[PDB]
Design a protein around this ligand. Structure first.
Ligand code: SF4
Ligand code: F3S
Length: 106
């Protein structure tokens, strides 16, 4: 499985969803998650993220391990997103800011 981590929060560019061959991204207010059962590990989304927030689960940073689990449980509760959208208005001011998990919205 590929995993969306901290820097997607409050950016949510959604570039990643056009490349997914199996449409396994799910959408929250200010973040996206990958459903781990569905991902086929094609790695196509990882170069597409402006925020470089996607990682192979074996590559997730030591300080971001919580995201592996988070992606798995939020994917169960959020709706499927299959079309790109515009970025959050604010996206480019929040891109690169650390610790954005305290800003996550369910
Ligand atoms: S690795 Fe491939 S299948 Fe998995 S979320 Fe990315 S684009 Fe979709
Ligand atoms: S910022 Fe988030 S919505 Fe996709 S393009 Fe990057 S994982």
């Amino acid at each position: 499985a590929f995993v969306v981590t901290d820097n997607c929060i409050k950016c949510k560019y959604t570039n990643c969803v056009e490349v997914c061959p199996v449409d396994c991204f799910y959408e929250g207010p200010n973040f996206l998650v990958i459903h781990p059962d569905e991902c086929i590990d094609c790695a196509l989304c990882e170069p597409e993220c402006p925020a470089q927030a996607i990682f192979s689960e074996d590559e997730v940073p030591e300080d971001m391990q919580e995201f592996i689990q988070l992606n798995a449980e939020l994917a169960e509760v959020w709706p499927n997103i299959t079309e790109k959208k515009d970025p959050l208005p604010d996206a480019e001011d929040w891109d690169g800011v650390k610790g954005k998990l305290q800003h996550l919205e369910r």
